[PDB]
């Protein structure tokens, strides 16, 4: 199953991210959160490249995300920022991402747009092509995200304009997630 | 100029009073008596002159070196006009509860407005200065809030009864220690709005500062205090939660009054609505969403069944308003936002949750008939609470939530009563689609035992309704039709829950008041309905479907295999039930 | 990182570190500028020149950012902001004298 996620990773790599496949990667990240967190250095490169590409693509569609699917995007982004800050705090040799690039990925999850250059994006795609990884299920994931929404109340206190407003809401959410982790201090 | 301003003839009075007040936060106002207020009114004109003078004097470059010595004096002048304005508002409320007139009202309004402006200039000057611009700004904001909150509380607490009883210092402590809400007006709104602003800032300060980083902060700009201490000070001086809710309720109710007047002081309900909406937002964000333990603890303690009842009342008022309007819509959405926050927040006790549910009339353990139609927020809130309860149990694999089980049982009993009576219900007396959707969702979360019991009860109800054919043959089956639709859904969707159902609830009830709810409908039946129905739009979905436009499938395995298994189990007498269904056709 | 809300909490303890980092580039930049001055007096080289120019530019930029942060903060500013300005001016003047 690790295979299909690299699909939205590569299908979108070709011609921008398909919002349609997005609700898939969000799911993936949250499901693999604990693993990205305490994984083995054997698949460090794989996990690191996964996180970087996921962050970049989620930022690329920051302004355009279903308002209903917007909350799951914020959950997956909190997971990604967790991995990024963990790495920036404990520099790892097996990590396939530079501290500059990791700081820039947090900056993009927390700012208007991502900045990772395409040359570096293809480098990440190659470190992912490394494949150095460790229906009914779709409906199960749907019910999981449904409980997620019940617990995750939007509380969003304070067309094209709405798209920019959705983008700013995502930005506020991820800034909160970074501060949630006291990452500012870290 | 500073000396001249601080040496104003009318200012000196309030200045001294405010200083006395700063000691032991003994907030007091002298126009408590109507006659006292009248005398205050008499002096309005010269008071207006002095206020304007001080305002313009501070407007031109002054107190450039905000050295602590000047900083202190300038803050004093600002808080002094603040107290003057709050006392003017208090005397206006006193005259109102007792009841050049407009001239005096004009003077008073001018005084309050200009007074708040002096405060804001002094505040902006402090915040924009290089000598004392930050912690001093924060303590200036505390002093201001404190004054505003105390005044608002006092004004609201002023009742004509107490007024005539007195018939001079308006000690807030006395009212609290001793412990209609009249006296709230445009001026009250103005002060409340400014007070809300100050409150928001100190709470944002709390949030940025480490969670749960002592004594009540001291009422001094120079005094260095923790943000928590400042908030602690405000709470200790006056009950933050109580005052906020009091203002909220009064504002909303007053707005409604103005609306009614229009249907038949500013007469703009929007004004009060705006204040009310702001209050909701502040509490939800600064408090409800606040992760600070101190804040949450205070909230939980402050929360009372009375508050729940008030909240329920407002919800019902908004839900039963029937007028979207403009600002009303914003307030309505904010209301729901607050309601859902309460439902999700652990601050609301289970006791408080049940209290709110009963006050709405949607208590899941109440007696009588189940409300078939539930109001847009009364339904959304109920659904949120029940679903969160089912999730708690599901998270720990706990047994079927009895409340939701009792919900379904009561609902089915009411439906059988309606079908036994076969009386056509009104739209307000007919089960709403979104309600049906959340009920099916709850039925799913239930374990085999719960869902099988529901199926058996449905079979028994249909069989009993078939016992009297003559009445059924001459009774409108609108409710029986709804029951049969529910049973049919529970035939193609019993073992599993459909993705559309989740989306419908997430879109209809997990949303503040697309406005159109998400659901399916009887194409031919809805066509005939339109043949003789309102032309504007479809106000209420009397005819609908929950089975979805499922691909046409022959009876072969049309009914769920699990559902088939249950029907032939000892619990369900299918052979006898099927005969009743055949008879029901008549 | 500085573009992020990393130094946003100007807590007294953080305030010290926030000032520390700011004047740190200030010193780094003034020293890089002094090195460029030594090179000019002695006179991929163009590449290194551009590198040092970018360094000094971002040095001043970080100084300005932390300054405005301490100025508009509700937990710092006034004399604190004035003293940050004083220290920055000291560093810059001493650098000018040395170069």
Curated annotation (Swiss-Prot), chain B:
Modified residues (Phosphotyrosine): 104
Subcellular location: Cytoplasm; Cytoplasm, Cytoskeleton; Nucleus
Comment, domains: The UBR-type zinc finger forms a pocket that mediates recognition of type 1 N-degrons. In addition to substrate-binding, the UBR-type zinc finger probably positions substrate proteins in the proximity of the bound and activated E2-ubiquitin conjugate to enable their ubiquitination.
Protein's organism: Homo sapiens
Family membership: Belongs to the UBR4 family.
Domain of life: Eukaryota
Record note on quaternary structure: Component of the SIFI complex, composed of KCMF1, UBR4 and calmodulin (CALM1, CALM2 or CALM3). Interacts with E2 conjugating enzymes UBE2A and UBE2B. Interacts with RB1. (Microbial infection) Interacts with protein E7 from papilloma virus HPV-16, HPV-6B and HPV-11.
Name the UniProt record assigns to this protein: E3 ubiquitin-protein ligase UBR4
Function: E3 ubiquitin-protein ligase involved in different protein quality control pathways in the cytoplasm. Component of the N-end rule pathway: ubiquitinates proteins bearing specific N-terminal residues that are destabilizing according to the N-end rule, leading to their degradation. Recognizes both type-1 and type-2 N-degrons, containing positively charged amino acids (Arg, Lys and His) and bulky and hydrophobic amino acids, respectively. Does not ubiquitinate proteins that are acetylated at the N-terminus.
Pathological association: Episodic ataxia 8: A form of episodic ataxia, a neurologic disorder characterized by episodes of poor coordination and balance. EA8 affected individuals have attacks of unsteadiness, general weakness, and slurred speech. Additional variable features include twitching around the eyes, nystagmus, myokymia, and persistent intention tremor. Inheritance is autosomal dominant.
Modified residues (Phosphothreonine): 516
Signal sequence, renumbered to the chain: none
């Amino acid at each position: 199953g690790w295979e299909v996620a690299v699909r939205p990773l590569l299908s979108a790599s070709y011609s921008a991210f398909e919002m349609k496949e997005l609700p898939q990667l969000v799911a993936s990240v949250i499901e693999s959160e604990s693993e990205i967190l305490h994984h083995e250095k054997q698949y460090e490169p794989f996990y690191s490249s996964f996180v970087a590409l996921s962050t970049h693509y989620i930022t690329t569609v920051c302004s355009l995300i279903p308002r209903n699917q917007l909350q799951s995007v914020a959950a997956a982004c909190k997971v990604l920022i967790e991995f990024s800050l963990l790495r920036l705090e404990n520099p790892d040799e097996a990590c396939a991402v530079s501290q500059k690039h990791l700081i820039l990925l947090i900056k993009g999850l927390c700012t208007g747009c991502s900045r990772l250059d395409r040359t570096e994006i293809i480098t990440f795609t190659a470190m992912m092509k490394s494949a150095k990884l460790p229906p009914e299920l779709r409906q199960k994931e749907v019910q999981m995200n449904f409980l997620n929404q019940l617990t995750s109340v939007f509380n969003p206190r304070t067309d094209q304009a709405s798209a920019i407003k959705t983008k700013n809401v995502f930005i506020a959410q991820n800034v909160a997630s970074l501060q949630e982790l006291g990452g500012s201090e870290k | 100029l500073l000396r001249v301003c601080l040496n104003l003839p009318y200012f000196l009075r309030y200045i001294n009073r405010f200083q006395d007040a700063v000691l032991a936060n003994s907030f007091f106002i002298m126009p408590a008596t109507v006659a006292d207020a009248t005398a205050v009114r008499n002096g309005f004109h010269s008071l207006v002159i002095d206020v304007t003078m001080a305002l313009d004097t501070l407007s031109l470059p002054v107190l450039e070196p905000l050295n602590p010595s000047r900083l202190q004096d300038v803050t004093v002048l600002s808080l002094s006009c603040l107290y003057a304005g709050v006392s003017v508002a208090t005397c206006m409320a006193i005259l109102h509860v007792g009841s050049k007139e407009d001239d005096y009202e004009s003077d008073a309004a001018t005084i309050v407005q200009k007074c708040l402006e002096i405060y804001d200039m002094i505040g902006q000057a402090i915040s924009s200065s290089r000598r004392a611009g930050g912690e001093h700004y924060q303590n200036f904001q505390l002093l201001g809030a404190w004054c505003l909150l105390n005044s608002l509380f006092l004004i609201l607490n002023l009742s004509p009864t107490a007024l005539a009883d007195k018939g001079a210092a308006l000690r807030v402590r006395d009212i609290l220690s001793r412990t209609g809400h009249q006296g709230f007006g445009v001026l009250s709104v103005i002060l409340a709005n400014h007070a809300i602003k100050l409150l928001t800032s100190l709470f944002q300060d709390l949030q940025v500062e480490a969670l749960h980083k002592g004594p009540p902060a001291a009422l001094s700009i120079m005094a260095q205090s923790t943000s928590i201490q400042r908030i602690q000070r405000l709470i200790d001086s006056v009950p933050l939660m109580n005052l906020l809710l009091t203002l909220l309720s009064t504002s909303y109710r007053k707005a409604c009054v103005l609306q009614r007047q229009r249907k038949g002081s500013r007469k703009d309900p929007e004004l009060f609505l705006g204040l009310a909406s702001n209050i909701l937002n502040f509490i939800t964000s600064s408090m409800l969403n606040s992760r600070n333990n101190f804040i949450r603890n205070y909230l939980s303690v402050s929360l009372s069944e009375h508050h729940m009842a008030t909240l329920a009342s407002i919800i019902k008022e908004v839900d039963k308003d029937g007028l979207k309007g403009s600002s009303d819509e914003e307030f309505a959405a904010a209301l729901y936002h607050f309601n859902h926050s309460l439902v999700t927040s652990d601050l609301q006790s289970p006791n408080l949750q049940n209290t709110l549910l009963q006050q709405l009339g949607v208590a899941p353990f109440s007696e009588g008939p189940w409300p078939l139609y539930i109001h847009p927020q009364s339904l959304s809130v109920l659904s949120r609470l029940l679903l969160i309860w089912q999730h708690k149990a599901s998270a720990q694999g706990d047994p079927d939530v009895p409340e939701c089980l009792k919900v379904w049982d009561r609902f089915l009993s009411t439906m059988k009563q309606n079908a036994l009576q076969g009386v056509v219900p009104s739209e307000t007396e007919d089960l709403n689609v979104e309600h049906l959707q959340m009920l099916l969702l709850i039925f799913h979360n239930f374990t085999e035992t719960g869902r099988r019991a529901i199926l058996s009860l449905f079979v028994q109800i249909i069989q009993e309704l078939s016992v009297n054919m003559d009445a059924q043959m001459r009774f409108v089956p609108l409710i029986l039709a709804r029951l049969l639709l529910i049973f049919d859904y529970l035939l193609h969707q019993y073992s599993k829950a459909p993705v559309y159902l989740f989306e419908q609830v997430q879109h209809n009830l997990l949303s503040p008041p697309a406005t159109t709810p998400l659901y399916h409908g009887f194409k031919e039946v809805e066509e005939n309905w339109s043949k003789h129905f309102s032309s504007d739009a479809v106000p209420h979905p009397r005819f609908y479907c929950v089975l979805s436009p499922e691909a046409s499938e022959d009876d072969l395995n049309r009914l769920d295999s699990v559902a088939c298994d249950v029907l032939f189990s000892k619990l369900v007498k299918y052979d006898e039930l099927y005969a009743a269904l055949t008879a029901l056709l008549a």
